[PDB]
Symmetry: D2
Subunit: 291 residues, 4 copies
């Protein structure tokens, strides 16, 4: 597998004119010290959408180079344009990424037949492991377990980041694909049930603020200490849910700033939280002893 445990979907800290590389370096070092198992750079939580192609490439390369092989680095390389996804994926491979996080098409969408073609086209272009990212609440498109079954024997297609929230579906993926498709939770409030179904970790928002707890939750469960893992899930659940009270990464970035991490502002169309939601987030941060 690319990694097991907690993979942080790291934020991209911005200055008001670009990427705050000094801050990103600090976060990298902190994650390594905090037992984060992998870094996913330029995922959704990283605001790739609102970065230029040059910012994306510089940020991905920065993370790769700073991590310096200490943990795996996975880059978000997919888009809703297949040619573009191929080119970005080739690029990331060429500069030493350990894995590619490749979203389904979104907005334009496609059929299940088209999903097979899309993923096969990206895979055929590379020799690096691919994590399919299924997030229908954002993309409008659900890749089915049957379609995943058609893709999981592909040499490079090793895993899925399953953010559907549909636990039935995740059971079906495991039943059909087995070890041919590792499952990462794509929802922090669903780590335990997904690990219970044979998942191997999480690609996490929550790990941006409590990386060691997320790592520990996974490690405990995977080591059979299931009750101890569950306690972390439940004790962190209200905070976790507060991190989705508005579109991620609005809350997590807000939270990190509340925690004195100085990670800068969001890029439009993302923006500051409303008053009520900010107060819920503060409450849960305080209750978890984070501020």
């Amino acid at each position: 597998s690319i990694f097991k445990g907690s993979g942080v979907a790291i934020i991209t800290p911005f200055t008001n004119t670009g990427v705050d590389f000094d801050k990103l370096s600090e976060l990298i070092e902190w994650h390594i010290k905090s037992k984060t198992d992998a870094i996913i750079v330029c995922g959704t939580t990283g605001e790739a959408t609102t970065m230029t192609e040059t910012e994306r490439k510089e940020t991905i390369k920065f993370v790769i180079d700073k991590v310096n092989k200490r943990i795996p680095v996975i880059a978000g390389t997919g888009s809703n344009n297949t040619a573009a996804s191929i080119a970005m994926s080739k690029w990331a491979e060429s500069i030493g990424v350990d894995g590619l996080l490749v979203i389904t098409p979104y907005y334009n969408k496609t059929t299940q037949k088209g999903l097979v073609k899309h993923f096969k086209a990206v895979s055929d272009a590379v020799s690096t492991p691919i994590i399919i990212y299924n997030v229908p609440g954002r993309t409008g498109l659900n890749i089915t377990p049957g379609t995943l079954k058609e893709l999981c024997e592909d040499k490079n297609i090793v895993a899925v980041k399953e953010a559907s929230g549909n636990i039935s579906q995740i059971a079906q993926i495991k039943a059909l694909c087995g070890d041919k498709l590792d499952i990462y939770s794509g929802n922090d409030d669903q780590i335990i049930p997904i690990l219970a179904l044979g998942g191997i970790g999480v690609i996490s928002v929550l790990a941006n603020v409590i990386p060691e707890d997320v790592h520990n939750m996974c490690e405990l469960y995977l080591n059979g200490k299931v009750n101890e893992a569950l306690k972390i899930q439940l004790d962190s659940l209200a905070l976790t849910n507060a991190l989705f009270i508005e579109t991620n990464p609005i809350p997590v970035k807000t939270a990190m700033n509340l925690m004195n991490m100085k990670v800068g502002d969001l890029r439009l169309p993302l923006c500051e939280m409303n008053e009520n939601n900010l107060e819920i987030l503060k409450k849960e941060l305080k209750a978890y002893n984070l501020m």
Copy 2:
């Protein structure tokens, strides 16, 4: 708790004109022998909707009396009319039931405020444990975790049969209620993730055909043999899903008849499966060595 492990939502076998008590007796003995942990009588799977009040009472009393305290018996006593729910619940208590399975209102529905009033009205009338039954895909109404939190301190409200299929919701219920509200899965394809979140069993359709396997799945997980448990979940998943290819209990009664159990016909508005779906069911019964 009322029980732990596998509670079969037992079918009601019908003759042409009434309930087949002889067949019900056989099923009851078979469950006991097969290590079923509890029987839920006149639940949805029991076709209580299409039974007269006298048929319901006779069936519930028959199960209670036949079981003779060997394992817990829980009766479906709720409906969408609060007065009727009270009366039926008091009746079941009076003839020695161990627990009451009390659905939310359905079709008429109500507000979350109304749900608290409904369940408190029922509870205040009895001194028997109540399992709230949440199944929004059937009722049109979801009882929320916040509403459950308002009810879980009630003396009699001890559990929920959670059939929403929303694993995030189930985590939230556990986080809010803890030990004050036991969770039973109401979906057989979700046993493992629900137990992983601290559920204590299942009220099961699947147990009508493979009672020992469902009991073992739960026992193994609850005893820490989580991988062993998961294997049973995944190996039985395609059959499980087949049992919902049409409205339950259409497939399970069909399956039991294919297994030569002679459990009679469904009552309208339930009816025979279509050709393609029957085929799928047959395929999965054969693949699981049941016919």
Copy 3:
């Protein structure tokens, strides 16, 4: 057709021990004077669920007898038990009802195949026109346009009360069934678009409080005065939406009492509105010059 225009889904006014027949008579007379085109008695808005069989029969008969053929009377006779729906439908026919409003099964549900059997079984039992009532948000079950196509050549099946809210679906019903299935809106906020697709009226909640406006909206549109009709729809929309801010008939009954109509209290599991929602309803009542 049974009727065109506005059919009120009349409330059932209750005393604290039964049905307020004196009040129901007053409402009947008021509807006749207010140009209501039909009365639907013991529909969902009439709280049939929480009435006894004897109350239902007495109420249905009362309305039939008091109306005395001045406008059509349609009774809610369907349930989720086919035998029960047959018996009630036969009964209503025997005492001179003009039409039967027959809901899909709910909660127990069934397949599309089973829906055909259910409706055919009820139809075969009677010689009175039937309005199929599709309300999936309450029943958990949507009867499809294809299934309606299979039923619309049945002698007695004349119409559908379409409360899905799915305008695409309603277009498909008209395209497939034509004049063989009249369409009544089952949502007051959708009268205009449904009439525009060839619907012939509404079975209305709103008509309980503004019967002449609902009648006029329909009559205008059906007479080609489409802009004048639309103005009534839009001017009443905020009030209409307030009447669904909680489960109907909680708001409409509350509204009628706010309007000094003395229609009594709701039966559990229905209950009084919460404070915020009550204030929204009051606001819209006042803005429409009703209180």
Copy 4:
């Protein structure tokens, strides 16, 4: 208004390596001759996602220049990145577009607060009419009627292309915004009900194959010939639905090629239809006398 009636969301015909400007020219002339009221270039149906920035610009400019003010031209200029949306919108304005079709963010999404900031940022940069495009089934994000009410007083925000398929929502937009926000249907199977609620036209897929019929449908309704209009809606409904049997523009390009229009192939991740769906499409094209 920018236009009334039928605005074709024109396909972009591709050669193997670029845009087929010769074919686009032919389509443009054919639309003008067929009484199409406006052309929307590089909308969803135009496969803007899979076009380079230079291809988009050249195509939009080509349509503008070719049309030469004969009918209004509207360009798709929005994306999920606010800065990019601003830039593209200013560009289109600079080369003489008549209107801007500006989608909500998608995939990244944002809050309702963010939506107001996004659309105000775009509007503040231009002096050209803006049509907001709401399509939650593709974007994951619904702009609410209340949010639209906050935007509709903006000088440039003059319309919405409403593709939610939620007819209740569309009534609410009209009630709140009135003349300050023109409504175009974004779904061809919903033209009649949307016009009935005071919409002024459609931004249409169907118009790619039957432009004159779509224009006539709108004209007839808007001129009060509502039954005549409805007939066209219902007669074309099965074809309309066939055009969405797979992700648009898969079916419409397929259809245009079946009609011997030689409009080239789809760009990945879009692809060829499956067998069964092709068959359905063929059936409906033949039934409508198109092939």
